[PDB]
Structure formats: structure tokens, C-alpha cells
Ligand binder design. Structure first.
Ligand code: CA
Ligand code: CA
Ligand code: CA
Ligand code: CA
Ligand code: ZN
Length: 316
């Protein structure tokens, strides 16, 4: 769309009010011209055909309940773009300011969200297991990071490489949650999952076993479900990443934490410089050690922590 950049206001899934970047041309559209080549949000109108209609609104105010998921998908995509740019100096997911597109109200009662290789897609949830998925900044950032991985390491979506791909998305979705300072934690999806139950979440990075995911390599899943457990075995890496950041003792191995910022620097370097489509856990560890080495010196504490963390989860 060609029009005048402006700012509108609305309410998100959780009821919070926020300002969003819109474009005016007869209607006000969810098109943010301020970030790279633009952020565009579409209405899939409960269908599965994509992307749907670019989101149009008559008055630049988005307080209808049907508006909520669009407001958040649009807003959280801006935040994530900012995170990447400000913190890692990366322009959009391709490093060249590619437009970011998302569709909301995808299908009926759809309990998931995903990056399809071209854009983001968010279901509204069935109202019991989930509420509209774009209300969780960690979910939004998890999906967008899949775009980043696709353009860089290109980790294939299955077995160990696929688990690494998933872990990368949870790690960065969590870092983004901390960046925005939106009640941050080391849990995944807590804000949109089981609205009826407080205190739970989809996955836990601090204690993956809390939900039955592995927290040690000896406990990995070897079957075929979930593409070979991409969402299961990601727990081993997630745990390693939490330990690198926060420190702790796990299975008798002690790790000194080096904090979130360095965690992000180290994993982003590994991702963009050293990982390849078929990398396995053991390769991830070498990549992570090489990155810390690059960044902090081979005799650094940082390197030492990365080593300890992987030894703690049994990845050699
Ligand atoms: Ca309106
Ligand atoms: Ca949170
Ligand atoms: Ca979270
Ligand atoms: Ca819940
Ligand atoms: Zn994912």
C-alpha cells in the first residue's frame, strides 16, 4: 500500500493498550513503514488460504476483540525486529531488511503458530488450550527466529538439527521477552497457554523435565514422532542455554552463569557463522565453544561456562 505513515492505538490479547504503526490510504492499514521494508499484518478470516487481506481499519483504533491478535502480531513483530537490529545489528530476518508478514485468525480453533518459509501464521486457539497465539511475545519471537535460522544455518527440521532449530527459537524468543521487559521468564508460551491454569507453560528452559522433556542427553527421544522429537529434545539444549546464562549445578556438574547478553552473543555467532543444515548436538557444542573463543578468548570464563553447560547435559 502507498500512503501516509501514522500511529494508531489498540488493545492486545491480554487487554493491554499499545500504539502501533499504521498506514493511511482511505483506510488505515496494519502496515508499519518505519522498519526495513515494512511489517504487514493480514486477516486470514478463519480460513487456511494465505496470506489473506492486508488488515484495514476505518478509524485507526483497534479495540474490537477481533482486532486483538492483529494488534499483538503487528506490535510484537516490531519489537523483535528492533531486538535483532539493536542488539545483533541484523536488518530483518534476511539481513537485508526483508518485509515481515504475519497472518492472524488462521483457521478455526487452531492451537498453533508457525513460520511457513515465507511468513508468520497465528491461530486463535480453541480458547481452552490456548488463546490467540500472537499474545505471547516469546511465541512471536520464536517464530520469527525460525526465519533467521532459515536464512543462515538452515538447520533441517528433523532429528538433532531440528531440535537445535527449535532450541534456537526458544532461546531467542526468551531473550526477546527479556529485551522488552514484559514479565520475563525462562518459560515458553506462558502468556497464551491454558488460560484456565495459572503458573504453567508449554515448555520450560529452566527445568524442561517439569513437563516431561529431557534435560540430559542420556534421556533423549529416539523415536519418530514430532519429526524425531524436535520439540522434545530441544529441552537438552534449552537447559544448556539456561545454565550458561544463569549458572547452576545440574547432575552434579557446576556451571557459573555469564548472563543473558553474552548467551545471546555467543549463540547468534554460532548460528550465523558456524552451524550448517545438518549440524548435530555435538557440532553445536563445538560451534558454541568456538564462538565464545572468538569473542572472549580461549582462556576465558565464558568459554569455560559454555563447556561446563554442555558437559552438564551430557553433550560431548
Ligand atoms: Ca477501528
Ligand atoms: Ca513471561
Ligand atoms: Ca516466556
Ligand atoms: Ca496457563
Ligand atoms: Zn518452532
Amino acid at each position: 500500500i502507498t500512503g501516509t505513515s501514522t500511529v494508531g492505538v489498540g488493545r492486545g490479547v491480554l487487554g493491554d493498550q499499545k500504539n502501533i504503526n499504521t498506514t493511511y490510504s482511505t483506510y488505515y492499514y496494519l502496515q508499519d513503514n518505519t522498519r526495513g521494508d515494512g511489517i504487514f499484518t493480514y486477516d486470514a478470516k478463519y480460513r487456511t488460504t494465505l496470506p489473506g487481506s492486508l488488515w484495514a481499519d476505518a478509524d485507526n483504533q483497534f479495540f474490537a476483540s477481533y482486532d486483538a491478535p492483529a494488534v499483538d502480531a503487528h506490535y510484537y513483530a516490531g519489537v523483535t525486529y528492533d531486538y535483532y537490529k539493536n542488539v545483533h545489528n541484523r536488518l530483518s530476518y534476511d539481513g537485508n531488511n526483508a518485509a515481515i508478514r504475519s497472518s492472524v485468525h488462521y483457521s478455526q480453533g487452531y492451537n498453533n503458530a508457525f513460520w511457513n518459509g515465507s511468513e508468520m501464521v497465528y491461530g486463535d486457539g480453541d480458547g481452552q488450550t490456548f488463546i490467540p497465539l500472537s499474545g505471547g511475545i516469546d511465541v512471536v519471537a520464536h517464530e520469527l527466529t525460525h526465519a533467521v535460522t532459515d536464512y543462515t544455518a538452515g538447520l533441517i527440521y528433523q532429528n538433532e538439527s531440528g531440535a537445535i532449530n527449535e532450541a534456537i527459537s526458544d532461546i531467542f524468543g526468551t531473550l526477546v521477552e527479556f529485551y522488552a521487559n514484559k514479565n520475563p521468564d525462562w518459560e515458553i508460551g506462558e502468556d497464551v497457554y491454558t488460560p484456565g491454569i495459572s503458573g504453567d507453560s508449554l515448555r520450560s528452559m529452566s527445568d524442561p523435565a517439569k513437563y516431561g522433556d529431557p534435560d540430559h542427553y542420556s534421556k533423549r527421544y529416539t523415536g519418530t514422532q514430532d519429526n524425531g522429537g524436535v520439540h522434545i529434545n530441544s529441552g537438552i539444549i534449552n537447559k544448556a542455554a539456561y545454565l550458561i546464562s544463569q549458572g547452576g549445578t545440574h547432575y552434579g556438574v557446576s556451571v557459573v552463569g555469564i548472563g543473558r547478553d553474552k548467551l545471546g552473543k555467543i549463540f547468534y555467532r554460532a548460528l550465523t557463522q558456524y552451524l550448517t543444515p545438518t549440524s548435530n548436538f555435538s557440532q553445536l557444542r563445538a560451534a558454541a565453544v568456538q564462538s565464545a573463543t572468538d569473542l572472549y578468548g580461549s582462556t576465558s570464563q565464558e568459554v569455560a561456562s559454555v563447556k561446563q553447560a554442555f558437559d552438564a547435559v551430557g553433550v560431548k
